[PDB]
Write a protein that binds this DNA or RNA. Structure first.
Ligand SMILES: [Zn+2]
Lengths: 1362, 72, 235, 42, 40
RNA sequence: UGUGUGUCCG
């Protein structure tokens, strides 16, 4: 039917070059592009028929010829567009508003009931709670604008289909504004009398396009004017409106929870900020983003001004104020602003400067940077910016390069020595290194303080290769569904022929990675290595390197590079090799906080050759990519080549980049002065150049990070200070430990630490400058207590909240493969969980999520894009209209039972659940108990088991055999397998995907589950180390709907079209939910009666399903109790007796966990009123032979053999079972791998799989401020009632419960001193020691696998043995 | 006779060797001192020269046309 | 006979044992030099552009020669200081960028440069409204600081006062009542035509001038007219 | 007696002289290699 | 035993020759340093 | 007729 699927969210840069074409077809005037070629080119077949469209001519019949740019009008459209007109959409989004409010009220009531039931609730409650929230929701400023913009988005997204002939338009008339839409193009008709005026009498928007005299006669007798834009501006405006609505709603709701002081700024200051920014943008055009960009640094400075106020704390704010004043002054001198406008334009930054809020509120306000839009990008300006800093000449100092290289080598040698035993057998004339000979002979390493007279001796060390080139353990990196550049022969085939002016001679066949990986016959890792070693990237047809403009930002333009396919493979292989070899000698991510560390360990670490003070400073890692030259990076590249067995692999970029012709592959504008004559040797102009001497962002990031770490280490060696570094995103933070005597006071200690940090910063600046890379002293700031880095901000050890950045991104519409409801709901749930992980309030985020869930459900029910207009999903799948009760009930049963619920209240305590089935059962039971529908549990949880194989069971060990709980992954995997069968002449994939691959996978899965008893986690872990796992990981590469609907190989396989299958499966899935009283049976319901236990219920449900897999064998290691139902809280008072431990504890007593509160306060910001504002004191067998540089296959074989040996310990078949698995992985036979397998001697394998192999990291779901103020005792349990208790989740539950209980009360009034967690006597059992028993053997032939990659390798013991 | 000849051979240049060792030490130290005051600039034909040299050291022949950025 | 020869051989072979101690240092220094210059020749390609070649290349088509080149600190510095031999502009700016960072110490690292106009704009950004007499006070404070070279003390004290908690008006009050140069100073007198130049917000602040004005007492400026009309302002 | 003293004298001056000869040979080799590298530059 | 003195004398002459060669090669290196660096 | 207008490394 169609191969187009426009997306619902903005994901592309805003370029308006093609709009100049449209205004030429209608007879208007516009100047959006700087390329004169578009001024007189040839119009395409479409957007030329606009001269014959009656609607367009009628629309443009009372407007001037002149137009205005759209970047001056967006704030005006935002301010003056409410929903009061007529729209072609029949079901208006505002119609279903009461139901959303009702659902939000119900969800809030359920959360409150759940909290009261657990035992947290709250003291001194108020009756005026529901009405306050209802008034807050209905009193929002952006309530109707959001619905209107969603209607507009639906209209434009539906209209962007129909790529064929005879396209149509849509019309909207909203009071003052008129909107016309035609095929990705939008016309806005607006009144003139509402535009800001110049001193010459013309609008500010017309200054840069028309002269003062031309515009006046151009308009003359007119009152409305027309602007032209694309469909991306509408999506951007919709996103802005949604973000503003979310922020206002959250800020308003949070005031009800904590009337005294909340952690969000306000709901009135943000509105003034929005208005000021809108006015500034409407006056200054797209150049106002230079001023808007200063919001974050000002917030950082204001946060920094909340401390002891040393002498140099206020320098950052002064520098930022000076910078913003200069920027404001130098962009407004040409423009003829009136004095009133000049006074009014500074209100934004004047309000920002004069703010007075707590650090938490400033940290929250830090996250509204992108609430005003994004600038319009041009290729010429971005290319001009990139050309500078890339062709500039540099001066370097050889001595600093020598020292950095020596430190690089020393760090690599030290990392090799720390692990792996001892030195690496230094060859090459030991007499050339006098001084290291003693250390090598004694088999020791120099400490660190004394390596200053022997640093040069590290230059002469030589050794064999230390790392292997066959350590690839993931084939999914070579097929990732991306786009690459084209061959140099057809380099100009990526531009539109009409704009170009000529038909390109040569054409490319494909431009995507997956449609090139499958047709490469000679693909192999060794082939890639040989391609790199022969300098084949220097061939004349392999030098293109296009640019592509980056996504939504606030700069004038940033780019990223694209390379042809083989060079892309070389780049990927280099990154993969570096991630496993080097760059582990240079630990980048090291997060440490001085106020949250043990004093003894900190003192030991800070000692170089007593209290310890620490300081820090942060520098930027963004532009350094353009500052790298070959003269500086040559020795490091050569050493990296030598550490492997390769010759010319790591210097591909510096060899092939300067030989390329640099240009931006923008579809609607080619390079200037491009003709058919100068096609082979095109000239360079404003958007092209030849000599690129610097590096490229993204590529070779790990090597540059290692070089930066080496420079930091050299600085640390030069000056006797203890330095630690961390690198994330585009920034790095360096902390310095000073160590101080005892009797030195605590007032001048901070000053001395800051002085030491400044000295280290100056030394680092000198060292970095000597290498050709320049720091910014004006931007680098030095502090003592405040550290911000990546996603974590701390102020003197106190963590600061940041929840708006995740909470404001909730939206009913998201890209989730064919607008799947399950994916959208899952994304909303994940966003809610991540947002609640921060902050200390609960209700605003849950209210926002509940608001958006119902809205998404309704908008997908009525306005699905995958079907025709007027289609109703909820009418023809049930036969009757869908009502509120069915939707409300269908949103309460958890997803593990197949019920479209993703907001579990239990996630408010801890992140990872031990067992999802028990938690879902408890949640459903509580929900059904709250309302008067208690006699409804059994029909809801009975259902009908579906059809599945052992593969499905292995994929989801903790899942159930419910058809409605499945995702779309199986469908996509089947499609990809079908495509590979009829295609993929890769000649190495074909060997892996042979005729009987599915049968082999089924046999392996069936054998793995034939044990007694059956264990699922062990089988899942084993299955991933077989060729079946490799095939499974290769199959799953599809990511988007556009790739599915537009891929050539996928859609050329004949058979039924993919769209019909997608519609059929969507209809089946929608019928599965919302139906009820149909897909249930009366054979399991009566067996589940009179149980009254969640663990037994879950076990019976699990065993009833998968019955065709497990005939009669027991299932173990899959059911765990829900900890909410396992413990009970008492909340003792300072001087009281616990009834549980005193009244009925005569015969045996009850084990319990004790929680107590400390008193020492350490630090507090701004006060000690709130618990979350303060932190306290308190911290939250070997193998006989060790292989040297083992391959990935050898490591996987060793791990698999160890697992199989340990799991089956009481039997004598450990020899016969392992052999068939190892025959397909490694050349070595049995009794040789067994020598390298570590001797594992543990008990209760279920405990080892639960909390030793660590499938999940567990951890907490709350801010870590309160965890430092509590002491938890678990030894009181005695015999620990081993058992089903997970201690980490016990600690997390206790800490989170205490935090939630007291979150809106000041600390001086908390009347509870300690808490008792008493375990119930029903949900706790004793787990015995059991071992698996296999009676048969796999007896499958796996010797056919003799290929490269993650498959059988020859000579695995090549690097030697320890 | 032979012992006298051996003594003469073993004692004739040793004084010259001792004189030469001090001069060599001085000149090496003074060159090391010079090395710390150098300034190097970056040219636009370093990568091209390195690529050509690497290509000549494997299937020795000039790289295929057209010419590189700065062929000199 | 032979015993005397052996004794003479031992006597002549004794003084060659001591050269080992002095050849060890020779080994050390030679190894260091070889490492340094080996890396130097490694990091530069085959276009090292000898000094005569680059000197000749600078004369005509003055762009720098292809390939790297080597100079010395004092030599290139003295060449730059003499603007007669037409040193290429790119080399000049590169060396200036490299050199400008050597004057960095523990102090004056991120220290800003504050002028009169910048300080006046900063003070304006804090005061509310426009046309208030506090603007005239800011103007006279900046003028006095510019003619007395005490802008940074004024700015530091203003920032400290603002950060400790008082309002900007109180900060200006402490500025005019604490800085030593603001002790017993006659307020500046400006020339005005009529009430039109006086802002609307300043109308309530006009006061007859008494003898012996004081900047500390609260006299910010004196307005004089042609017909002997002198007035002052009170805060 | 004289022969034994001669043998002892010969044995005394064996190791250090050989070690320094080896060091000198290594230094000459590396210096020659560096000069050969610099030769193809002028 | 007496004829073994050649084994204890033949390394010394080569030692002197190698010292002379080292002096020559270092003096030669000084020439390249003079010819490459701009200096004053 | 507009080759999938685009959506890269971690
Ligand atoms: Zn108790």
């Amino acid at each position: 039917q169609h191969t187009q699927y426009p997306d619902a969210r903005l994901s592309s840069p805003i370029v308006l070059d093609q709009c100049d074409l449209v205004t030429r077809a209608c007879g208007l005037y516009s100047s959006y592009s700087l390329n004169p070629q578009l001024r007189n080119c040839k119009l395409p077949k479409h957007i030329y028929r606009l001269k014959y469209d009656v609607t367009v001519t009628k629309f443009l019949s009372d407007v001037p010829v002149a137009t205005l740019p759209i970047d001056f009008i967006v704030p005006i459209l935002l301010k003056a567009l409410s929903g009061n007109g007529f729209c072609p959409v029949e079901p208006r989004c505002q119609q279903f508003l009461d139901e959303i409010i009702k659902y939000t009220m119900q969800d809030a009531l359920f959360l409150k009931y759940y909290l009261k039931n657990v035992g947290a609730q709250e003291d001194c409650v108020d009756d005026h709670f529901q009405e306050k929230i209802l008034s807050s929701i209905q009193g929002n400023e952006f309530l109707h604008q959001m619905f209107f913009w969603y209607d507009l988005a639906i209209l434009t997204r539906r209209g962007r289909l129909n790529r064929g002939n005879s396209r149509s338009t849509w019309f909207v008339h909203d009071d003052l504004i008129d909107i016309l839409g035609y095929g990705d193009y939008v016309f806005w008709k607006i009144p003139i009398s509402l535009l800001p005026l110049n001193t010459q009498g013309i609008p500010h928007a017309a200054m840069d396009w028309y002269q003062t005299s031309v515009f006046k006669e151009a308009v003359q007798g007119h009152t409305h004017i027309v602007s032209v834009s694309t469909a991306d501006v509408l999506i951007m405006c919709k996103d802005l409106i949604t973000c503003r609505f979310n922020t206002t709603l959250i800020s308003k709701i949070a005031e009800v929870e904590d009337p005294v002081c909340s952690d969000y700024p306000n709901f009135k200051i943000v509105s003034m900020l929005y208005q000021s920014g809108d006015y500034l943008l409407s006056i200054l055009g797209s150049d106002g983003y230079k001023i808007i960009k200063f919001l974050e640094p000002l917030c950082l400075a204001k946060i920094q001004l909340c401390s002891k106020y040393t002498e140099r704390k206020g320098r950052f704010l002064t520098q930022m104020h000076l910078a913003v004043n200069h920027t404001l002054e130098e962009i407004t001198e040409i423009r003829a602003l009136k004095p009133s406008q000049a006074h009014k334009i500074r209100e934004f930054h004047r309000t920002l400067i004069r703010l007075e809020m707590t650090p938490q509120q400033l940290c929250e306000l830090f996250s509204i940077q992108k609430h005003w839009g994004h600038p319009v990008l041009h290729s010429e300006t971005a290319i001009q910016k990139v050309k500078k800093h890339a062709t500039v000449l540099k001066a370097l100092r050889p001595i600093v390069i020598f020292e950095t290289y020596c430190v690089f080598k020393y760090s690599i040698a030290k990392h090799y020595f720390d692990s792996q035993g001892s030195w690496y057998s230094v060859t090459s004339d030991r007499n050339l290194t006098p001084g290291l000979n003693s250390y090598i002979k004694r088999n020791q390493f120099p400490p660190l303080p004394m390596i200053k007279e022997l640093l040069w001796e590290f230059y002469h060390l030589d050794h064999p290769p230390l790392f292997s080139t066959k350590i690839i353990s993931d084939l999914s990196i070579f097929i990732k569904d991306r786009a690459t550049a084209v061959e140099r022969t057809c380099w100009d085939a990526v531009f539109e022929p009409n704009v170009l002016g000529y038909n390109p001679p040569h054409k490319f066949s494909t431009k995507r990675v997956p449609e090139q990986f499958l047709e490469q016959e000679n693909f192999s890792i060794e082939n890639v290595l040989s391609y790199a070693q022969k300098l084949e990237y220097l061939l004349p047809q392999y030098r293109n390197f296009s640019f592509s403009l980056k996504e939504k930002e606030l700069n004038v333009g940033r780019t990223f590079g694209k390379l042809p396919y083989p060079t892309r493979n070389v780049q990927t292989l280099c990154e993969a090799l570096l991630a496993d070899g080097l760059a582990k000698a240079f630990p980048s991510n090291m997060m440490v906080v001085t106020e949250r560390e043990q004093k003894e360990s900190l003192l030991h670490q800070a000692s170089w050759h007593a209290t310890v003070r620490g300081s820090s400073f942060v520098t930027d890692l963004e532009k350094y990519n353009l500052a790298f030259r070959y003269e500086f990076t040559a020795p490091f590249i050569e050493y990296c080549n030598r550490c492997y067995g390769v010759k010319n692999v790591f210097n591909w970029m510096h060899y092939t980049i300067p030989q390329c012709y640099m240009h931006v592959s923008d579809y609607y504008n080619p390079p200037h002065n491009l003709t058919l004559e100068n096609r082979n040797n095109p000239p360079e102009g404003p958007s092209s150049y030849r000599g690129h001497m610097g590096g490229i962002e993204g590529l070779q990031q790990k090597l540059w990070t290692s070089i930066s770490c080496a420079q930091i280490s050299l600085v640390e060696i030069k000056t006797g200070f203890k330095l630690r570094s961390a690198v994330m995103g585009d920034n790095q933070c360096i902390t310095v430990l000073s160590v101080f005597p005892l009797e030195t006071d605590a007032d001048e200690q901070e000053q001395s630490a800051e002085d030491n940090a400044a000295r280290v910063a100056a030394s680092l600046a000198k060292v970095t400058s000597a290498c050709g890379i320049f720091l910014k002293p004006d931007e680098t700031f030095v502090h003592s207590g405040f550290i911000y880095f990546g996603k974590k901000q701390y102020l003197n050890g106190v963590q600061l909240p940041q929840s708006l950045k995740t909470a404001t991104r909730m939206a009913p519409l998201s890209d989730a493969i064919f607008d799947d409801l399950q994916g959208t709901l899952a994304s909303i749930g994940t966003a809610f969980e991540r947002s609640i992980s921060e902050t200390r309030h609960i209700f605003p985020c849950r209210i926002t999520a509940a608001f958006h869930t119902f809205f998404s459900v309704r908008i997908l029910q009525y306005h699905h894009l995958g079907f025709n207009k007027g289609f109703d999903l909820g009418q023809l799948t049930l036969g009757k209209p869908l009502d509120f009760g069915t939707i409300s009930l269908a949103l309460a049963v958890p997803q593990v039972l197949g019920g479209l619920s993703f907001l579990n209240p239990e996630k408010c305590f801890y992140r990872n659940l031990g067992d999802p089935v028990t938690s879902g059962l408890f949640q459903l039971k509580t929900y059904l108990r709250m309302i008067e529908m208690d006699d409804l549990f059994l029909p809801l949880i009975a259902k009908n088991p579906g059809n599945c194989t052992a593969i499905d069971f292995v994929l989801n060990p903790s899942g159930l055999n419910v058809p409605g709980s499945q995702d779309l992954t199986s469908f996509l995997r089947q499609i990809v397998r079908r495509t590979i069968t009829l295609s993929a002449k890769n000649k190495l994939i074909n060997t892996l995907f042979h005729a009987s691959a599915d049968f082999e996978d089924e046999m392996v899965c069936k054998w793995l589950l034939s044990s007694t008893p059956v264990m699922s986690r062990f089988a899942a872990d084993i299955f991933s180390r077989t060729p079946s796992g490799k095939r499974l990981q290769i199959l799953g590469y599809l990511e988007g709907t556009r790739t599915l609907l537009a891929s050539k190989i996928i859609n050329n396989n004949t058979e039924t079209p993919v769209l019909d299958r997608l519609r059929k499966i969507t209809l089946q899935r929608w019928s599965l939910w919302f139906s009820y009283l149909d897909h249930c049976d009366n054979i399991l319901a009566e067996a589940l009666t009179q149980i009254t236990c969640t663990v037994d219920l879950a076990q019976i449900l699990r065993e009833y399903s998968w019955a065709h897999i497990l005939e009669g064998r027991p299932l173990i290691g899959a059911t765990l109790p829900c900890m909410i139902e396992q413990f009970k809280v008492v909340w003792l008072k300072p001087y009281e007796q616990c009834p549980q431990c005193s009244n009925a504890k005569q015969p045996g007593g009850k084990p319990f966990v004790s929680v107590a509160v400390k008193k020492h306060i350490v630090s507090a910001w701004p006060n000690a009123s709130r618990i979350s504002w303060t932190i306290g004191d308190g911290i939250p067998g070997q193998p006989a032979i060790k292989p040297k540089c083992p391959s990935a296959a050898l490591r996987e074989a060793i791990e698999l053999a160890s697992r199989l040996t340990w799991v089956t310990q009481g039997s004598s078949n450990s020899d016969l079972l392992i052999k068939p698995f190892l025959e397909a992985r490694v050349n070595l036979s049995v009794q040789e791998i067994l020598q390298m397998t570590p001797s594992h001697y543990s008990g209760n394998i279920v405990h080892r799989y639960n909390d030793q192999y660590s499938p999940h990291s567990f951890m907490a779901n709350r801010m870590s401020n309160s965890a430092t103020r509590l002491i938890v005792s678990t030894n009181t349990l005695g015999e620990f009632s081993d058992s089903n208790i997970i201690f980490q989740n016990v600690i997390n539950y206790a800490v989170a419960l205490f935090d939630i209980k007291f979150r809106n009360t000041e600390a001086t009034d908390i009347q509870y001193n300690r808490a008792h967690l008493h375990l119930t006597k029903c949900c706790t059992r004793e787990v015995p020691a059991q071992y698996l028993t296999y009676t048969s053997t796999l007896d499958l032939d796996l010797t056919r696998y003799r290929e490269n990659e993650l498959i059988y390798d020859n000579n695995p013991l090549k690097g030697g043995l320890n | 006779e032979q012992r006298i000849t051996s003594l003469e051979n073993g004692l004739k240049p040793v004084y010259d060797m001792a004189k030469t060792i001090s001069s060599l030490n001085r000149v090496c130290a003074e060159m090391v001192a010079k090395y710390d005051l150098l300034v190097m600039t970056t040219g636009r034909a370093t990568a091209t020269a390195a690529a050509t040299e690497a290509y000549w050291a494997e299937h020795g022949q000039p790289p295929p046309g057209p010419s590189l950025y700065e062929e000199s | 006979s032979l015993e005397q020869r052996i004794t003479s051989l031992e006597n002549g072979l004794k003084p060659v044992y001591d050269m080992a101690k002095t050849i060890s240092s020779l080994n050390r220094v030679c190894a260091e030099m070889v490492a340094k210059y080996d890396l130097l020749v490694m990091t530069t390609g085959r276009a090292t552009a000898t000094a005569a070649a680059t000197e000749a290349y600078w004369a005509e088509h003055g762009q720098p020669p292809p390939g790297p080149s080597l100079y010395e600190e004092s030599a290139i510095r003295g060449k730059i200081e003499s603007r007669d031999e037409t040193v290429p502009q790119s080399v000049r700016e590169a060396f200036n960028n490299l050199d400008s960072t050597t004057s960095l110490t523990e102090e004056n690292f991120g220290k800003p440069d504050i002028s009169a106009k910048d300080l006046r704009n900063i003070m304006y950004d804090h005061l509310p409204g426009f046309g208030t007499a506090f603007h005239q006070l800011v103007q006279v404070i900046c003028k006095l600081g510019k003619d007395s070279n005490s802008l940074d003390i004024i700015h530091a004290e203003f920032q400290a006062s603002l950060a400790e908690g008082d309002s900007p008006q109180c900060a200006l009050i402490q500025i005019t009542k604490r800085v030593p140069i603001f002790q017993d100073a006659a307020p500046p007198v400006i020339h005005i035509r009529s009430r039109g130049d006086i802002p609307r917000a300043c109308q309530k602040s006009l006061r007859p001038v008494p003898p012996s004005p004081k900047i500390d007492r609260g006299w910010v400026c004196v307005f004089q007219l042609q017909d002997g009309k002198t007035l002052g302002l009170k805060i | 007696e004289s022969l034994e003293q001669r043998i002892t004298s010969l044995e005394n001056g064996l190791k250090p002289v050989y070690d320094m000869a080896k060091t000198i040979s290594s230094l000459n080799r590396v210096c020659a290699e560096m000069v050969a590298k610099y030769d193809l530059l002028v």
